[PDB]
Amino acid sequence: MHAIVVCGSKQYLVHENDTFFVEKLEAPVGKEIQLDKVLMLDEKIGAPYLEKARVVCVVEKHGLQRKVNVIKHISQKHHLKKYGHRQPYTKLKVVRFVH
Amino acid sequence: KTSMLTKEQANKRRQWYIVDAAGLVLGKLAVKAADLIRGKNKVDFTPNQDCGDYLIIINSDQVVLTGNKKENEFWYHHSQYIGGIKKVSGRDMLKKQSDKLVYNAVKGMLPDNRLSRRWITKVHVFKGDKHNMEAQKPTTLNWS
Amino acid sequence: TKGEVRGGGKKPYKQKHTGKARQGSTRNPHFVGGGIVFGPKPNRNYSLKLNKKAHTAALHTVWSEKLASDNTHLVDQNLFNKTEGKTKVMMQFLKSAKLLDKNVLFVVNTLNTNLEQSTSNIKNVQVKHLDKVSVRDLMLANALLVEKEVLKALEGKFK
Amino acid sequence: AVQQRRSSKHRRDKRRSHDALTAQALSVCQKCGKKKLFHRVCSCGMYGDLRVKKAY
Amino acid sequence: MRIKGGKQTRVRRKKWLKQASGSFGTRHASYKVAKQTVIQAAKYAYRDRRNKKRDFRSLWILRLNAALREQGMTYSVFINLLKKHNIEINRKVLSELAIKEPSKFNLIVQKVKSEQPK
Amino acid sequence: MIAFAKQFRVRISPQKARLVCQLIVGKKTADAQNILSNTPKKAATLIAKLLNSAIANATNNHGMNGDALYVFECVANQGPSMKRTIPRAKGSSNMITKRSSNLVVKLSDNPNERQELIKQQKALVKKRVEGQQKAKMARQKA
RNA sequence: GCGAAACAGUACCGUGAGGGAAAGGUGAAAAGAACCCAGAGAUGGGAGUGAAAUAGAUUCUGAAACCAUAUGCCUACAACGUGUCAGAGCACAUUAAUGUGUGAUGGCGUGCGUUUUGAAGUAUGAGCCGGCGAGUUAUGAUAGCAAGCGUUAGUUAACCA
RNA sequence: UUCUCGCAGUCAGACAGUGGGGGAUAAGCUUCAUUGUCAAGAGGGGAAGAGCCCAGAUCAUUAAAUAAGGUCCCCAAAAUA
RNA sequence: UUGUGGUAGACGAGCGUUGUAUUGGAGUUGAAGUCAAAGCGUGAGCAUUGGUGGAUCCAAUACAAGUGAGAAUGCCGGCA
Ligand SMILES: [Mg+2]
Ligand SMILES: [Mg+2]
Ligand SMILES: [Mg+2]
Ligand SMILES: [Mg+2]
Ligand SMILES: [Mg+2]
Ligand SMILES: [Mg+2]
Ligand SMILES: [Mg+2]
Ligand SMILES: [Mg+2]
Ligand SMILES: [Mg+2]
Ligand SMILES: [Mg+2]
Ligand SMILES: [Mg+2]
Ligand SMILES: [Mg+2]
Ligand SMILES: [Mg+2]
Ligand SMILES: [Mg+2]
Ligand SMILES: [Mg+2]
Ligand SMILES: [Mg+2]
Ligand SMILES: [Mg+2]
Ligand SMILES: [Mg+2]
Ligand SMILES: [Mg+2]
Ligand SMILES: [Mg+2]
Ligand SMILES: [Mg+2]
Ligand SMILES: [Mg+2]
Ligand SMILES: [Mg+2]
Ligand SMILES: [Mg+2]
Ligand SMILES: [Mg+2]
Ligand SMILES: [Mg+2]
Ligand SMILES: [Mg+2]
Ligand SMILES: [Mg+2]
Ligand SMILES: [Mg+2]
Ligand SMILES: [Mg+2]
Ligand SMILES: [Mg+2]
Ligand SMILES: [Mg+2]
Ligand SMILES: [Mg+2]
Ligand SMILES: [Mg+2]
Ligand SMILES: [Mg+2]
Ligand SMILES: [Mg+2]
Ligand SMILES: [Mg+2]
Ligand SMILES: [Mg+2]
Ligand SMILES: [Mg+2]
Ligand SMILES: [Mg+2]
Ligand SMILES: [Mg+2]
Ligand SMILES: [Zn+2]
């Protein structure tokens, strides 16, 4: 019913048919990925990580986050540097919980 | 990216409580009163929604101050004029106005805020066993 | 410049005790009257020097790449005077040769008059002597008609 | 004395908030019907039932 | 060749003005005050990204600490028991469990309480 | 259906005219005339003339009922100024700014006239978005 | 750009020598708005001419500061470099995008240039907006890079066509 | 960090620890030697602080372990004897 | 694999404006200008649509500069 997965470095609590956003995974939209690291599943929680517990997910999109403008400025010191960041993400939805 | 946590959307599970300060220390009573008023002890704490329960304090004149603080520690209030600094000893506060003393002690343990006004409002402090607050059906808990 | 512009060489206001800022003239660069600090001048050179052998080498490679290519046909005196001085005949010649849109350049050694009478109302095509063509005129051509004796003079000039 | 800081366009309107005008009380003449400001002679010189001035 | 400035100054100025949209009065109208506010707002945004990472951790710690005190256990010992039992779960997900799934959160506390470490 | 009347370079200042214009906005025709005829202000015998002309060209030119007209908006926009030199003391001088106002009065017959203005604004926005979508379809077509 | 695109060395300043501005654009064609209504009139609203009158003599385009009107959101126990990160509720629907407008409330937060060991500064400079406003040219020297020509090399200056 | 060539900027420094001179074992004083920081360096502690302590900011993450410092409330985190 | 705080300063790589030369292209079925919008870039910056506007403008490769405005009790005009 619920699981604690570790995609990238973050931990997500996921239900059935739940769409959450993780860091870029380098996978085309439409494929069927299998998340490996699972912490808690149902009621049996493994200490380091559960063995053979897999979370089957489908990748929906590979969009980018909102633009972030980093403007570093040293007051009265002739230093105004500007930079932009658009962090890529990937959205994926849970399909089935492997036993 | 990640999943955001749940925060209460102006949900009011607030309830009424009763405590008896028969022999409770001023500071030891005030710390738990502030925790109860702020709702910090609640499982779900959203710090912009004042999710904290009301509290009524009985027997304010019966509280105690340890040591020689009843005659050596002074409470100070200054008006905006010159010389308007009024001083009251611990014993005088414990006799003349004990409700104000407990009220001020609880207020001092709260963050400078625009919600702290409402938080200190939800403290009903009485100097006697009687109280006009029995229509709220407040539950009774000790040493809180 | 600041000195050349007609204006008052006096101080408009006093140096001190006036609420206004210090000023020294009414025709300063930061004034609306206008004294241009540096500005363009009519004494600039704009000229560059290139060695004689370097120019010969540039002309050598440009002739090499332009020659032995398409639209580099050979021409003689007969059609240089068969034009009759009428540009209609030369328009037909360019139409027959399919060189209408090309910027064909005639390279001529004897300065024929009938060919020069024509091709003068044509902003596209042009005719030059061997001692008059340069690198730029050669590679702007996109097509050229070279006389046989012009070609004989070309090997001689290169040496 | 003069302002060391310029007053914005918001403080100006806050001060002018009390500069609004009031509508003077008006009534109807009892012989011709046109509106006249209260407690004053109308345009016909007829105040109540008394002919005050000659007609305009 | 007198190059004249036009559409160059105005475009780069209107960019700063567009960024400073929603400010108080002249802070969105004049280019100079708008530019200063955008730079200051960028500094604030930079500093608060770091501070968000720390403040949300503190909130999770507070919620988790409260959820434990109802059961008689403290935060300082709960994390120690988690480490000895090898269980690796964020305080974020643990707090999310205690707010959304009380029964399963109670299951985790029960195992860390008494079961043999490893 | 808004009828309107205008007056350029009115000698009254906009500051001293807005005070009188706010006494007639939203008022009925007859009541607005009655209010403006008995107010002891300079900018009262000029707004009255503009109002009367606007009523005339509303019930004659545009064909309105005449018993449903209300003052929709009466404003005094800023007009061109005139600069003069007032001689001060000790040889100094200041600049007197003679202020003028562009007066405009507008009356309507429909008490819901603001809705149509918002509707026209919405229509302009919709046409912009519709053009963008049509351009996107063309882009995908190629 | 000549100070001067217009009737500019004019208006204007000074006893005088002298100093010295600003200001261009209707429309293809005046066809420059007959006539009606309100008004004392200018003028405005219709009509008419015109492709266009929101091109109307205020006459190409019309920016910002500035002044007013209004849909939507918020604001009268509130300590504020006015923003930022979270965040309810309200109102909409887009360069379809984990959307947009406002922001009850919580955490954090003393501007920009200058010159100084050190400026939130009780040091300094700017009321705001727009335009203009400060590393050039000529002749030589050195060094880096690159090309042409080369071991009795290399290259012309003036001048002539 | 040695040698050769091109282009510089710098010649007003400040404080803390340590050894001294002048001063009175006064100075946030003045003049030296040496170790560091600031100048030209944010973050955390010191309630607030250029120079003290922990350290060195490429950007994003509502992930985890720690340094100085701390765990009644403000304000994250403790219990035994 | 080692790195990426930074003033004075040294070095390298680029953006943008006006014009000229070669190529191609758009424009009264609407160019420049100009306003608005919920776009794209690491940065100077670059697009799309709609309104207004009424005749020029754009892309590539080179070349030449009166080539980049927030400050000078800066000049001029307008407005608080
Ligand atoms: Mg000039
Ligand atoms: Mg206002
Ligand atoms: Mg007043
Ligand atoms: Mg400029
Ligand atoms: Mg006099
Ligand atoms: Mg005279
Ligand atoms: Mg008209
Ligand atoms: Mg005008
Ligand atoms: Mg115009
Ligand atoms: Mg209120
Ligand atoms: Mg109060
Ligand atoms: Mg305070
Ligand atoms: Mg606050
Ligand atoms: Mg805030
Ligand atoms: Mg503050
Ligand atoms: Mg600067
Ligand atoms: Mg100084
Ligand atoms: Mg000093
Ligand atoms: Mg101050
Ligand atoms: Mg001073
Ligand atoms: Mg100075
Ligand atoms: Mg000043
Ligand atoms: Mg300026
Ligand atoms: Mg050289
Ligand atoms: Mg020294
Ligand atoms: Mg010294
Ligand atoms: Mg020392
Ligand atoms: Mg000593
Ligand atoms: Mg000493
Ligand atoms: Mg000293
Ligand atoms: Mg310095
Ligand atoms: Mg520091
Ligand atoms: Mg600190
Ligand atoms: Mg680093
Ligand atoms: Mg730890
Ligand atoms: Mg420790
Ligand atoms: Mg705590
Ligand atoms: Mg660097
Ligand atoms: Mg160009
Ligand atoms: Mg356009
Ligand atoms: Mg310049
Ligand atoms: Zn009467």
UniProtKB/Swiss-Prot annotation, chain B:
Keyword Phosphoprotein: no
Gene Ontology terms describing biological process: negative regulation of translation; translation
Gene3D superfamilies (UniProt xref): Ribosomal protein L13
Molecular-function annotations in GO: mRNA binding; structural constituent of ribosome
PROSITE patterns: RIBOSOMAL_L13
Entries under CDD domains matching the protein: Ribosomal_L13
InterPro entries hit by this protein: Ribosomal_uL13, Ribosomal_uL13_bac-type, Ribosomal_uL13_CS, Ribosomal_uL13_sf
Keywords: Ribonucleoprotein, Ribosomal protein
GO cellular component: cytosolic large ribosomal subunit
Domain of life of the source: Bacteria
Functional description taken from the UniProt entry: This protein is one of the early assembly proteins of the 50S ribosomal subunit, although it is not seen to bind rRNA by itself. It is important during the early stages of 50S assembly.
Subunit text: Part of the 50S ribosomal subunit.
PANTHER family found in the cross-reference section: LARGE RIBOSOMAL SUBUNIT PROTEIN UL13M, RIBOSOMAL PROTEIN L13
Family to which this protein belongs: Belongs to the universal ribosomal protein uL13 family.
Protein name: Large ribosomal subunit protein uL13
Species assigned in the record: Mycoplasma pneumoniae (strain ATCC 29342 / M129 / Subtype 1) (Mycoplasmoides pneumoniae)
UniProtKB/Swiss-Prot annotation, chain C:
UniProt entry tagged with the keyword Nucleotide-binding: no
Organism superkingdom: Bacteria
Record-level Gene Ontology MF annotations: rRNA binding; structural constituent of ribosome
Biased composition range(s): Basic residues: 8-20
Annotated stretches, region: Disordered: 2-33
Spans traversing the lipid bilayer: none
GO annotation, biological process: response to antibiotic; translation
Record's keyword terms, sorted: Antibiotic resistance, Ribonucleoprotein, Ribosomal protein, RNA-binding, rRNA-binding
One Gene Ontology term, aspect cellular component: ribonucleoprotein complex
Family: Belongs to the universal ribosomal protein uL4 family.
Subunit structure: Part of the 50S ribosomal subunit.
Biological function: One of the primary rRNA binding proteins, this protein initially binds near the 5'-end of the 23S rRNA. It is important during the early stages of 50S assembly. It makes multiple contacts with different domains of the 23S rRNA in the assembled 50S subunit and ribosome. Forms part of the polypeptide exit tunnel.
Protein name per the record: Large ribosomal subunit protein uL4
Organism, scientific name: Mycoplasma pneumoniae (strain ATCC 29342 / M129 / Subtype 1)
Included stretch of the parent chain: 54 to 212 of 212
From Swiss-Prot, chain D:
Stretches assigned to coiled coil: none
Sorted UniProt keywords: Ribonucleoprotein, Ribosomal protein
Region described as Disordered: spans on this chain: 1-20
Domain of life according to the entry: Bacteria
Transmembrane segments: none
GO biological process: translation
Name of the protein: Large ribosomal subunit protein bL32
Organism per entry: Mycoplasma pneumoniae (strain ATCC 29342 / M129 / Subtype 1) (Mycoplasmoides pneumoniae)
Curated annotation (Swiss-Prot), chain F:
Function: This protein binds specifically to 23S rRNA; its binding is stimulated by other ribosomal proteins, e.g. L4, L17, and L20. It is important during the early stages of 50S assembly. It makes multiple contacts with different domains of the 23S rRNA in the assembled 50S subunit and ribosome.
GO biological process, one term: translation
Subunit annotation: Part of the 50S ribosomal subunit.
CDD domains the UniProt entry points to: Ribosomal_L22
GO molecular function: rRNA binding; structural constituent of ribosome
Species of provenance: Mycoplasma pneumoniae (strain ATCC 29342 / M129 / Subtype 1) (Mycoplasmoides pneumoniae)
Family the entry assigns: Belongs to the universal ribosomal protein uL22 family.
Keyword Ribonucleoprotein in annotation: yes
Assigned GO CC terms: cytosolic large ribosomal subunit
Cross-referenced InterPro entries: Ribosomal_uL22, Ribosomal_uL22_bac/chlpt-type, Ribosomal_uL22_bac/org-type, Ribosomal_uL22_CS, Ribosomal_uL22_sf
Source superkingdom: Bacteria
Pfam families (UniProt xref): Ribosomal_L22
Disulfide cysteine pairs (residue numbers): none
Protein name per its UniProtKB record: Large ribosomal subunit protein uL22
Gene3D superfamilies per UniProt: Ribosomal protein L22/L17 (3.90.470.10)
UniProt-listed NCBIfam families: rplV_bact
UniProt keywords, alphabetically: Antibiotic resistance, Ribonucleoprotein, Ribosomal protein, RNA-binding, rRNA-binding
